[model samples]
Target chain A: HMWVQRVKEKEAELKEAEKELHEKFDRLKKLHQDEKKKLEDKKKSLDDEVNAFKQR
Target chain B: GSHMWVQRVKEKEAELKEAEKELHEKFDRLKKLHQDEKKKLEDKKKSLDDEVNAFK
Candidate 1:
């Protein structure tokens, strides 16, 4: 039963590593989404403005 | 009795090492992918800048 503690510690160590990695991945994904969304809306506004100019 | 415990310890050690290596590899891959995706975002911004400037 005492031997099980080592195994548990190692398991926890790995879980800590996994949590850190997941946070990193999530941060990058969120940043990418936020940036793309901003730019895409900017592009869409130009589309509407350019079409209005074409009619004139 | 000692030999039996040694065997069990080694088995768990091996399992831990194998799993740790896999986690490291996955994190490395995700990091590289994040870099590439960020590069594309930067390029997209630059492209948008050029387009707006060229139209005017």
Candidate 2:
């Protein structure tokens, strides 16, 4: 019974970790897109500003 | 015996949950920092690129 209990404990922990890892990986993937879009927006905005300055 | 087995499972779940949360948080910070660096490099490139076109 004791050995069985230990096995059960390890299995539960691994399962939980596995579940959370999947969620975290998905979140990270989305974050990559979010960050890329935001940074591109920033860069493009500044590009316009600098060109306007050059013309002035 | 059943009671002990269930208790072990619960304990393992709590422990693993915390560890997973901490791991995710660390990853989030690392990614955020990485994006920040990339943004800086991109902004620098854009400035140079824009300046080059102005001379033409």
Candidate 3:
């Protein structure tokens, strides 16, 4: 539902209301997910470069 | 779900659900909000993409 955002306003409100006071924490989690993906891609490249440097 | 009739809020909510297409159109306004957010992320991603490009 989150992908195409089938979750509508009432549904969003329902989710938020049902979720209680957890909005901030959930937003933090989403931001963390985005950051984590970025960092992982960067780290993989560093690993390969360092390995190549050691081999040469 | 309360009204002057005060007995059909459940029916109203159900009727609204049956009109799911209208509900989707109503909710799709979030797409514009997400578009703005996506632009910010894309700009950040572009800078990161440039930095990664320079890594090689």
Candidate 4:
């Protein structure tokens, strides 16, 4: 019975850790998307400036 | 019963290890792709900036 209780505790801990890892991955994915969007916006602004100048 | 509990514990631990490894590899690949995209966008912006400056 003692070993059974110990095993149950470990299983619970493993589940918690697995859940945390998934949450971390999701956060990383969101952060990457935000950074990419910012960079693209910067590039678009520069592009517009160049085009406007060429038309002058 | 004790022996069975021990085996269960080991199996749960191995599952946790594999899950962590898989998530970590996935995160690394995404991070690398994000970095490459950011670099490419920055380079494009720099070139556009140069062109605008040339017109001034």
lDDT of 1: 0.60
How far residue B11's Cα lies from its native spot in candidate 4, in Å, is: 55
Off by over 4 Å in 4: B1-56
- Chain B TM-score by candidate, in order shown: 0.71, 0.84, 0.39, 0.76
lDDT of 4 by residue, B1-56 (tens): 34554455456556655655665677689777766755665565566556547777
Tens digits of lDDT, candidate 1, B1-56: 34554455456556655655665576678779867756655565566556557777
Go through the candidates in order and give each one's DockQ. 0.02, 0.01, 0.01, 0.01
Q: DockQ of candidate 2?
A: 0.01
- Candidate with top DockQ is 1
Estimate, for each residue in A10-46, the C-alpha lDDT of model 3 and write its tens digit. Answer: 4455445435535544575576556555545555555
lDDT of candidates 1 onward, in order: 0.60, 0.60, 0.51, 0.61
Candidate 2 regions exceeding 4 Å error are: A1-56
Lowest-scoring 10 consecutive residues by lDDT in candidate 4 chain A?
A47-56
Q: Please write out the lDDT profile of model 1 over residues A1-56, one tens digit for every residue.
A: 67457645655655565566568779966775665566455555555555564433
**Model 2: per-residue Cα lDDT over B1-56, one tens digit each:** 24554455456556655655665677679778666755665565566556656778
Per residue, candidate 2 scores C-alpha lDDT tens digits across A1-56 of 68557645655655565566557667877886675565456555555555564432
Q: What's the true lDDT of residue A48 in model 1? A: 55
Regions of model 3 farther than 4 Å from truth = A1-20, B1-56
Winner by TM-score between candidate 3 and candidate 1 = 1
